[PDB]
Every structure is written in C-alpha cells, then in structure tokens.
Assembly symmetry: D2
Homo-oligomer: 194 residues x 4
C-alpha cells in the first residue's frame, strides 16, 4: 500500500532529522563560523557534490550569490557542478575524476572554503576536490552520511565533517538540505543582523 510507505518516508526522515539535530549541532556551528570568517576575509565559498546532491551544492551558492531570507548584497560563492561545458570537457578531456579538482587548482584562493557534499563519502570527484583544496591552505566543510567514507581520513580541523546518522541516501540528502539552510541563516544573521 502506497500511503503507508509514504508515511514511512516521513517517519524515517523525521527520525533522521531528530538524531541529526542531537548530534550535528557543534559541527554545523563551527562550519558556520568558518564560512563567516571566510566571507569576511574577502574570500569565497566553493561548493561541489555528487548526483542530485550536486543540486544541493548549487542550491547553496545560489542562496549566496543572491539571497536566502534576509535581503543582502550578493556574497561570493562558486559551484563546481554548475559549469557544464567544463565538466563535460574535463569529465572528458577525456576522464571524470578530476572535474572538480582542476577547477579548484585554478580558482581556489588562500582563504576560500570548500563545501564538499557526498552522501556516500566515496565519490572520487569530491575526494580529489578535497585532496586538491588541502594542498592550498583551504578549509573543508564536508557534508557526509554513512561512515563518512574516504572523506573522513582526509581532514584535520581547519576542516569540519558533518556526518548524518543514516545509511539511506534519501534521508541523508534531506538532512543535508536542512544543514545548508541553517548555514545560510547563520551567515545571514551574523553578517547582516536583520
């Protein structure tokens, strides 16, 4: 019956949301402060993700290059997924694991912040992106789920890992969206007290 597995998705989401709130508090806070300090340093936030989680990465930087809730001037943010002709020209020219890493190598400045999103934490394009950013004195903000994948063993703490207590990609993406909206509010209320 459809209606009950509908409620299951809502039930499981809420349960994941709750567990996430009880656990990801401090990590999101630190990431927010890192973002606020980055934007105030004259730097930019770089975002990237995997699959439909790449829509979230674009969703974040779109909220910054524009506005979230508090009307404000555009804040410097870049998505690495948004560029099609580059990805299709790197993903092939002609291989896909370095689609994001090459963009960071060129655009990344000392003081920028990498917002890396990966539900599994095992997307090679996002991993190499993180590897790249580490090489350039660039803080990482990693949104993950599951165990954290190979992402975990790539971070000290100029970086933050936000690991969602869930093993379902759908539930991880849903929590990630809440996290992204929280950061936006944090950035908004801090930089533009309205």
């Amino acid at each position: 019956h459809m209606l009950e597995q509908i409620k299951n998705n809502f039930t499981e989401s809420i349960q994941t949301q709750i567990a996430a709130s009880e656990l990801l508090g401090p990590s999101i806070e630190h990431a927010g402060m890192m973002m606020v300090q980055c934007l105030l340093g004259g730097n930019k936030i770089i975002s990237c993700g995997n699959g439909g989680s790449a829509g979230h990465a674009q969703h974040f930087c779109a909220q910054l290059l524009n506005k979230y809730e508090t009307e404000r001037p555009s804040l410097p943010a870049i998505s690495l997924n948004s560029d099609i002709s580059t990805i299709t020209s790197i993903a092939n020219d002609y291989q896909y694991d370095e689609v994001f890493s090459k963009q960071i190598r060129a655009l990344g400045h000392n003081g920028d912040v990498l917002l890396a999103i990966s539900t599994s934490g095992n997307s090679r394009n996002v991993v190499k992106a993180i590897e790249s950013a580490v090489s350039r004195d660039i803080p990482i903000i990693a949104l993950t789920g599951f165990d954290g994948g190979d992402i975990s063993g790539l971070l000290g703490e100029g970086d933050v890992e936000i690991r969602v207590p869930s093993a379902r990609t759908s539930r991880i993406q849903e929590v990630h969206l809440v996290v992204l909206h929280s950061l936006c509010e944090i950035i908004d209320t801090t930089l533009f007290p309205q």
Copy 2:
C-alpha cells in the same frame, strides 16, 4: 548564538515535516498513482521549478532517468530547467515568463504528467507552464507551500496539489524533497517490486 538558531531550523523542519505527514498523505498517494499510470501509458514525466526549487525538479527526473534505490532501466523523465541554452534563449528571446510553457507546447504529449514545483505558488514561469499543460490534456502535480498561490485556481482533479503547511521557503523546500523521494519509492516499488 548560532547553535540555538541551528536547532531552531531543525526543530521547525521536524514540526513542518510532521504536520505535512499528517495532511499530505492522500495527495501524495494520488500523485504517485498518476505518475505510475503515466509511465505505464508509455508517457513521460515533465518537471519544472523555481530557483533552488528548480534543483529539486532536476533531482527528481535524474532519479528517474537513472535510478533511486531499486536498480532499474531508465524511466522517461524531462526537466524544463535543465536546458540552459533554451531558457537563456527564451528567458530571452527575449522574455522569461514562457521559458517552460514553450517547452511543454513542443515536447508535451497526451498522457504525460507535469510535475510543477513552486514554494510560493506565484512563479509566473511555473504558472504558464501549468496553463500550457492544461491545454493539452495533461495532469498536473503541483508541489506548493503557503496558500498555494495562483496555482490553486488552475487545477481540477486530473491534477493534484500538494500544499505544504508552512510559510517559510526553507521549510517548504525541505518537505518537498521528502515528497519527491516518496514518489520515487512509490514508482520504484510499484513498477519494479524489489
């Protein structure tokens, strides 16, 4: 203090999620059955949205043209937002309200289903898209929030409206994502009992 307004976003999300589950049950069910019947009719699902809600529209059709949880052959789905050179060539050539309506006029077939997403329910591009689809014997699945906007007064019931009980765009987008994932599971479990 950042950490408390973080929890607020989680609290408000959960509260919205709960209210949505208690109310949007039947509407999501009907939409699911309409989608399942559409795909079984040999037709396709057409999605479109506004802003970062346009990332959700692409997220859905990407879950279909590929896979959600159950591995399956690609299902016919199209996003109207995904096409850049068209939107930028309609949004200007040279005005933006008909970016989606013109795509439906050309691609839309009798039996297709329009997945229209709008947090405010007042995005003219999504409205005209719905107006267009009504003209072609095409069921509408409208994901909305707030009061439902002008979208509401455009639908009979070959169509469904799923209105999220919230007046915050962030909370509406978060619930919309849960709804989209539910439909994917509905489509998956129904068409491919795995």
Copy 3:
C-alpha cells in the same frame, strides 16, 4: 607575434569552411530532409555532443525549442547534455560512458532523430548513444571530423555522416556551427515558408 597567428586561425577556418562547402553539400541536405520528415512525423530531434561541442548540441535544440530566424512555434527538440543532475547522476551512478545512452533508452521514440556531434568521432558517450539509437529504429545525424572515428562504422543510411575535412578540433567545431545553422534554416524555410 600574436596578430599573425590570429590571421592564421581565420585563414585556416576559411580554408576549412571552403573545403567543407565543396564536399558536405549532399550530406547536409539529406540530414535536413530527415529532420524535416522527423518533425513532421510528430517526433523529436535528440542532440548530444562532447566537451564544448556539447554547447553546440544545446545550441541547436535551443534554436528549435524557440526560434532561429523565422519566428515560429517551438519545435520538439531535446539535448542530452543539458541535463546536469542526470549526467552527474549517471556519469556517476557511478560511471560516465552511458550518460546519453540511458537517456535515449528512456526518451527515444520510433521516428525520432539523433543529432550526434563529436569532433574526434571517438567519444564513448556519443558512440554508445548512437549504438542505443540504432537499436530503436532511430536515424542518426553524425557531425564528425578527422577520419570519422568509430562513429563511421556504426551507420547504415537511415543515417547520415557529415565529416569535416580537417584534423583540428577548433576548425571542426567552427564548421559544425555553420552546418547546424544551415539545418536550422532548412527546417525553417521548409516547415515555415517565410
């Protein structure tokens, strides 16, 4: 000296343009008639390309979903490159050679026409796309350069190959654009004698 290698690019382009005109005449004609018959059959044109040649594929379908020179109703055309959340969700889920083939499997109808573009003729994503379309009674229009790559040995003639007499990717893309604009005019003048 910059100014002379500038003129070289213009000289080489013109020379390639000329050679192309003297040779690709009939092939472009046939492709045009195939497109016109496709659109008149109630079918759609499917386009795809590789790299910055993927911008051309989108450029074509944008000219159709909208208008070229003669103002007209939108014609049914789809680009496989335009969909980001799908490619990034196929390119990884999680491998890239079937990003286009899977989209054709789902969306492709009997009577549609595949506009496959590849400067080298050796892009696996475009090849498998062609392989896929052959399996579905779908004419191929292949824009190539060099020797034609592996694309050549995949076509009978419900299909057309348009091979640019050049071994430089830049010169091939430049000629391809002229070819695309010719087809647009052909479609425009034939279907809407204005």
Copy 4:
C-alpha cells in the same frame, strides 16, 4: 532547393569570416594581451553571453579551466551563464536583468577581465554586467555584431570591442567562435610556448 541555401550559409559565412579577418585583427590582438596580462596578474577571466551565444561563453572558460590545444594546468576562468540555480534564482528573485551583474559584484576582483558576448549588443543582462564591471576597475572584452548596440557607448579602452561586420546573428556567432579560438591559441602560445 535546400542544397543551394546550404551553400549560401557557407558562402555568407566565408564572406563574413574574410571581412572580419581584414578588420578585427588589432582588436583581437589587444584583447589577447589583456587576457594574458590578466591571467599573469593572478586574476581570472569572467565570461557571459546571450542565448546560444551563452554556449560560446561557457565554451571559452571550459577551454581555459581545462585545455585548448597545448596541454597545460587549468587557468582561472568563470562563466556566469553556467550557474543555473543562481540565474533561475536571480532571473527570478524575482527579475532577470541582473543575473550576471550580481555575480560580478560578488566574484569580481580588481584585475579580472570580463568577456562579454552579445550578437545584437542589446542584451540587458550583458549590458548591466558591463556596467557592473566598469564600476570595479575591470577591463571589458566585448564580442559584438551589427552596430555594437548600447555596448559600444559603455567602453573606454582599458576595454576592447570586437564588432563583427555582419547583421546576421548566425554569421556573428560563427565569427565569434573563431575569435574565441584565436584568443585561446594566443593565451596558449604566449603563456605556454609549446
């Protein structure tokens, strides 16, 4: 007859190409040197366009974030068109004339170079982008056609205008592509003598 209007497009293209070569020599040279100096200053090239000319803007920066002919490290380049979730979130939030200007306001640095492309020279999104960049000590490289539109009366010469001697959008886009490929070679041969 189709075959003769095919040759007409080739004939007119070649004629436009020739006229362009005889006239746009110095302008392309200066733009190249400005780009080379920009990249050597530690700055980035910002590109934007209108419609299918927006595919060219992405095509250029993709050639830089990756490679053209000479294999090299990625060069810092950004397209303003590539970002979908932002444009759709600016184009509406909720109006379209400032989709590019807002991105320049946030990302634009002193020393960057704006590559503005417009066939008509009358696209308001590209105009305001130029207006924005002028306000920030940023050189403009404007690819235009026709009379140059309102773009012309917005430039001194820290900026360059490259006006194609043609009144046909198709012929202008074709010449623009040659110009873009010339600059790529200029940048390649100058910065990486291979």
